[PDB]
Amino acid sequence: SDPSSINGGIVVAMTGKDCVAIACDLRLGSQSLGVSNKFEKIFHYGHVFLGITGLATDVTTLNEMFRYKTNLYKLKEERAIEPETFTQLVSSSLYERRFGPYFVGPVVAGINSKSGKPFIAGFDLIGCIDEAKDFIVSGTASDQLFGMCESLYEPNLEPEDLFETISQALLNAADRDALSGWGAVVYIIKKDEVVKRYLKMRQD
Amino acid sequence: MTDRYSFSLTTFSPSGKLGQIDYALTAVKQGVTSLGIKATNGVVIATEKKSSSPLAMSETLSKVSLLTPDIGAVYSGMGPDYRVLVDKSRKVAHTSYKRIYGEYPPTKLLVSEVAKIMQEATQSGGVRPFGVSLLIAGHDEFNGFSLYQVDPSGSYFPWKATAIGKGSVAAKTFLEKRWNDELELEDAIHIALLTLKESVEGEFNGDTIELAIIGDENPDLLGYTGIPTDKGPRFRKLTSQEINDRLEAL
Amino acid sequence: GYDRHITIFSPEGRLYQVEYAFKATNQTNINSLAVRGKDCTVVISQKKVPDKLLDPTTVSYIFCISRTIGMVVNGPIPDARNAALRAKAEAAEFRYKYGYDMPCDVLAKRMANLSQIYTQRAYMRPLGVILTFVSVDEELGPSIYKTDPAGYYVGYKATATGPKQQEITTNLENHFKKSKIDHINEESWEKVVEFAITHMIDALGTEFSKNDLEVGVATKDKFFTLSAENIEERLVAIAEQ
Amino acid sequence: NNYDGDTVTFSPTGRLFQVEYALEAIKQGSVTVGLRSNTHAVLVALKRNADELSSYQKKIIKCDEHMGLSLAGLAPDARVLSNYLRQQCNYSSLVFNRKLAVERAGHLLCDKAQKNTQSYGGRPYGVGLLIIGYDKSGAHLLEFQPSGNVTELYGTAIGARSQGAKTYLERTLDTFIKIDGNPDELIKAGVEAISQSLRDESLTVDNLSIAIVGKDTPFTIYDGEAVAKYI
Amino acid sequence: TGYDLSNSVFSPDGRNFQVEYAVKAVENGTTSIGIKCNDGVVFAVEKLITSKLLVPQKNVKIQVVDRHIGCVYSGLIPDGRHLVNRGREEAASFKKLYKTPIPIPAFADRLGQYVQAHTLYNSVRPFGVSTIFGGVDKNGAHLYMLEPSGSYWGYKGAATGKGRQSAKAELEKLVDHHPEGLSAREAVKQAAKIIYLAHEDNKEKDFELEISWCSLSETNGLHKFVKGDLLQEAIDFAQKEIN
Amino acid sequence: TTIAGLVFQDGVILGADTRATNDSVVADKSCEKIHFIAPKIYCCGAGVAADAEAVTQLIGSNIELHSLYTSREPRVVSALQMLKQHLFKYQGHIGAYLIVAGVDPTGSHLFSIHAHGSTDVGYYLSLGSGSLAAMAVLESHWKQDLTKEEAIKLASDAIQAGIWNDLGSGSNVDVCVMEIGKDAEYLRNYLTPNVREEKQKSYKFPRGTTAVLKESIVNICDIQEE
Amino acid sequence: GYDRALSIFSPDGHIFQVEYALEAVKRGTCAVGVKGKNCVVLGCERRSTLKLQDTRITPSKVSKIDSHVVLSFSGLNADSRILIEKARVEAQSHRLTLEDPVTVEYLTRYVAGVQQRYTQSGGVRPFGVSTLIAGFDPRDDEPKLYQTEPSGIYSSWSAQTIGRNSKTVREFLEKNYDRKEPPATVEECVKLTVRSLLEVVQTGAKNIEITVVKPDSDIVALSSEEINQYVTQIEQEKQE
Amino acid sequence: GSRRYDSRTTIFSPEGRLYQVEYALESISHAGTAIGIMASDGIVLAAERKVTSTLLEQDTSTEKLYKLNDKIAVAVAGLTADAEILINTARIHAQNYLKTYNEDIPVEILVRRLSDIKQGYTQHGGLRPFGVSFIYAGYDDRYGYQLYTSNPSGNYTGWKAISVGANTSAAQTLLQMDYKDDMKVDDAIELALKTLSKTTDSSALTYDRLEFATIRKGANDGEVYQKIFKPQEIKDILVKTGIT
């Protein structure tokens, strides 16, 4: 009945030293029934990464929408969009549906190509921006993720330490939520290389 | 009480000319000389405040206009057409850009939007083309400084330096001799004032010349403090005093 | 030669319909003049009641647009009233939306932008009128702003409009060349009106009775027109010195 | 000449040529006569045939139980205007339980025809109408021209050669106005009037069309052997 | 040339020739007048009796607006009716919102702006009527006259149509000989006279007089037609003056 | 949320906390509740966070364009009128509760705007879940002709009252001072009374602690070119 | 909207815009339709002013409207696309509501109706296109060949040509086509179609295109070499 | 009324031609020449700028060659402003197709859409047609490399090599003379520049006058790369082919 928790799933993003990480689980369900264990929630438009939790149809729809918009942006501007600008685009686009919203919890992650500055942001379903320094959480186990992130996190982690922290935050949160899990993916993002890792986790 | 002009007033003649655009360019030719020069660390745009009467307060008539904090515009031709284009240019910067991306548009894209508006006057029903050529100078983070010309047709070209209107043929020859790629902003202002003296008959001073620059960020002109990222407008209109200072070193 | 019938460009780059709207401006054969004091803006205009059957109280080319703004027109009355009603509506709508009284210059710009649209759009003709707006603006002080059929507008220290505008203009030009200031250095509006009338008498070379003039005065927070008796008191003072 | 391309253009002498040309279509139309007394009002119409095989074009149209008209000019335009009258008569009945006044019916036709003369794209109506009716102020006869001018008359005629009938009625004025409580004699006077506009042809049984309305008489049309009595 | 073929086109003079051509239609029409009196107005009109077949007193030309305004016009009669119909809509929507009946100067502009609007576009024709109208409001009596251009002024006396020069001369005498003013019943009589005198320009056909009046004392400020004995008294007065 | 605004000798001052909450949890510990509208006109927003942000940004864009058109400094009454007329239109469905303050050629001004479009004029005002805690402090201490130094103290105190005593409010104190004839000064993180205490343990993991199934490089660049 | 009456009657009772549209058809490359006993063949001219063309991707002159009906044309190419699109839409719409594909006569009637609508609508000019529409009705083995034109008239033809020098190829077909015994086989029908084009085309085989349509949605376009064999056989028989 | 002033843009002449299309084509014949040449391993687009001034900022300038998506580009001949209206529409049609089907738009579908938009202006609306001819260069996985042209009539056709704008008669003769089917991109580059060099109304062909672009399936690992040549890169290729 509650759209944000039909399909389930989570996204978490963290900043580190000269890097960002964004991660997600792989579950798509119809409430109790597990349906797919390959539903990725993290997309990218050039070097800007967007995780989306919530109602799966809107997750897919918004991905297709932001691909569309960023493609036109690039043809007109003659450069890839940056995370700060994209964040504003995400907010704009969600708030224009203020009274018929997309039931999602988006999370922007990326490194500004000109300043080199790590950047993460989160939004509620109608586009209010939470531009955190430390971490952003989203999904059905957001409470669990807040609890993990808030204790596990420390600032200025190196890429390969940040991987461990964000992974353990995701995994232990997802195991305390019925509607998350079934696999997990972790992107480690640096200014000009991005590593993607699939995690081993309990499949219940 | 109907708008029955749903057909183009601009059409192709047998020779392939679009008459109304050509005539709009003729109106631009009769208009007062304006110019633009691009330096390494800035752009300058300039024109003569041709006062219709000495009783008129020419300060109130702004031929040089701020479009965004980092973009400025000047014209030659029909002033009323320019005024409304400035109004639409300012608005389109917000509606089609700032309210989407949370930042002001880059020079080329705002120019593109103005160009579009002028093109539509050249094809839409029941309208004549705009009788102006615009020179738009601006700066943005990824393209740097730039200067664009926009014609009644909706065509736009980027320039290192140019002139439009009355004495544009003579002025462009003058700019070709003086311009190089190592100019500082002060040097361009100096060249702008020299070039503009040739096309001016009567008085030549800070009160009869309008001149603005796209240069460094002006945090003093911002009006507020407390946000490190917002450093202030690059557009600045030179004062009557500031022009007369540079005319002594001329 | 249909380039002379609608608002499109001639081969010369000219809009003949705009130029002919300007000629309609002088169809009334009335001369107007506006000047600025320290605390006020005075506008005077010739009043000609040729018919004895006319009710002279209804013959006016001066309009009270808002409390603060007055508008004198040079041109045929139907277009004058068209422009007056629109200006009133615009001045009320402005106050409602933005919470303060519409400034004189902003109204002038708005009416000019409207006039511009008639020069670009073919189905609308230009109005054959020159609108001279006057107020004591709360920010700018005494203000004269004039709009024409071309959509051009500009501020003025003083101005004159009509068939003999050049004579009135040069008379005013010469006075401000002497005084070397942008206004009439005078405390009371009563004396600024006396100045306005005097310098029109000198320029036109004609004497006036109370019924040959029409006067409008802008002060802080109100614009008002003078009655025939108020003007008479003005004319008496001029004659007595 | 130059000023007759559309209805929106005045000539230099203040004339609307398109209206005057629409007026000309009435003159080409077949004659019809209207006349009344204090008790009854009568229409008489000379219907026109295309040739000997064809029917005779119907000239009279009923608008309500107490009102109707005869036409001269473009018959499709008379259909439009009559249909409008029917609706107005009907609107008055349904909403106000009130029979529409004949004078007010004229005013409505006038204003409908006027809109076509002042606006671009439209054309004037190319038809003249003679409206008869009996309302709360007795018998009435109206003449509608497509310029917009509607005129309350004792009698009149419109169409080709109508001037003959109109001069007759102008002489007979004092006689026929007094024909009260006698429908047949009032019809006779109308049939005699329309006879003044005939040349070569005469009034046959399928040629003639008569209608009448009055005090205790609904608007009824007579054609065929019902008008043989009056030939 | 070609500047007179389209409405809303300025000639090189600065004239709208189509509007001036509408004036020729007005000049071609029958004579109508208005007389402002002490506490009201009086309207009168010449109705040409084209034929004996016209019903007397039936083809009424003067029209009321609201309850307190009278309108008469010369020229294309249907155009005049279209304008009055508009006036009625204006007067109704004014009263609907503001409760009070529309003041006469306010009403005058509502027509003036509407007529003017028909000189702004080539898709419409100017009005082929000069309209004389007025009545009594809270500020007293008012008489107006409105031309095809949308130009209107207040008047002491007004006249338009074929006999306007004749009428105007007669109105100018009344203004000179009665500076303190004219009573309502006086104005009715003078109106009758002026229409009779102005009938020398339309002398071929005989005519029918029609008069109306608003007066604060005589009609309670309401528009009423002059009927019966008062109409006959005015006709007699007029007939005596021509002889 | 806890927002407040008050007037002093030759100016107006706004205050706000920095805690944004979803349900019972703390989504943001450092959010800006003081919104830019014009260089010398600001707005404190409580209620629905997206609605309050979006409404101020819109009016701020329209105020800028209006300023450009009229060649004048924008007025607080213009912002006030535009905000209320927009909020009224939406019948409280834009759940933004605002305190608008500023300086313009007319003088200094302070107004509150509720979600349904009602507006108040006051010398001190407070809105949001901590308004009662803040108003208690303002009512106890506010007086006429405050100095700027007293005004900042009182504003920050009113916000603090909310921070401590109200669960909805928390974290830091943002202040904006708009004084006549001077640039407005925006003071984000004016107070920082809620820095987290150091943790007992570092939960940084030994590398390889997490079990990994696959690895791959993501191509983020345009075209790898020949 | 733009409402101007472009197609109107002239004093002599002609609608010049419709007749001038036929002149655009007269300019267009020659198209010919010949129906046999168990097939229809659509021949089309390709003007050889344009070499360096890419014949894989260039719009082919014969278009499928459904799997069983085809449409060729002469006149303005851009105009033809609009008709072809509308027809293809109507073909699927008919299947969706009637549960049966269109007849060739129905499809022709629809296209003809669209062409007609443009000759008495405000703001539009007629289509500068005449069409040949050919195929077989569902579960029917009788060949169909219809012709439409800008005015909106349509009619059935044993054989017909349209476009430039269609006068000459109609002359040829009128003497060579026998109604009592039409081209019995596919070969004979194709040969008569190629022969008829060879009167006007004046060049070998690149300038001729052939499409054969047979019953039960059996449509195939002939290649250059297949057509070139017909051209060879025709002129070898002619040398005698 | 208004009828008086209506040019009637969408009518046939007695001969069955569309006046405005024909006159727009006459307009386009004065525009700077654009040449497209298709090879087995790529497409070349070469075009001559029209406004030689020394003061024109060439590196940020774009009058001739525009990108429609990552696979498809266009060369323009005619009114630049008109072309930019159409280009922004074509860019949107591409992205709509991508959003709907999750596949890049085939070249012919995009071309047909634009050409249909141009057609609309000749048949209805009473507006002037777009004074633009395009050369479309593109790639998709169905037909591979494709060249098309469209003109103001909305007619489009496919090509192996083609010219639009000025001196197309002279240009098409020269292309027809030297083109071959087994040709390669590097050869086509040379042909394009040689053709412009002979047909140009200018005294000599220089780098500051040209816009140049290639679409190659000679990117890393069998992808397709669009290269819009920078001014220095045009100057290099002019020296390489031996024109300057």
Ligand SMILES: *[C@@H](CS(C)(=O)=O)[C@H](Cc1ccc(CN)cc1)NC(=O)[C@H](CC(C)C)NC(=O)[C@H](CC(C)C)NC(=O)c1cnccn1
């Ligand atoms: C405090 C308002 S209160 C509880 O009435 O005193 C605060 C005001 C605020 C916060 C952040 C900004 C930044 N632009 C401006 C103003 N509002 C919130 O904390 C709201 C409180 C909700 C409306 C009860 N929180 C939200 O709007 C959050 C998004 C935030 C975290 C960005 N969204 C929701 O709570 C929510 C709940 N259900 C559906 C959608 N959103």
Ligand SMILES: [Cl-]
């Ligand atoms: Cl405006």
Ligand SMILES: [Mg+2]
């Ligand atoms: Mg689980």
Ligand SMILES: [Mg+2]
């Ligand atoms: Mg015009």
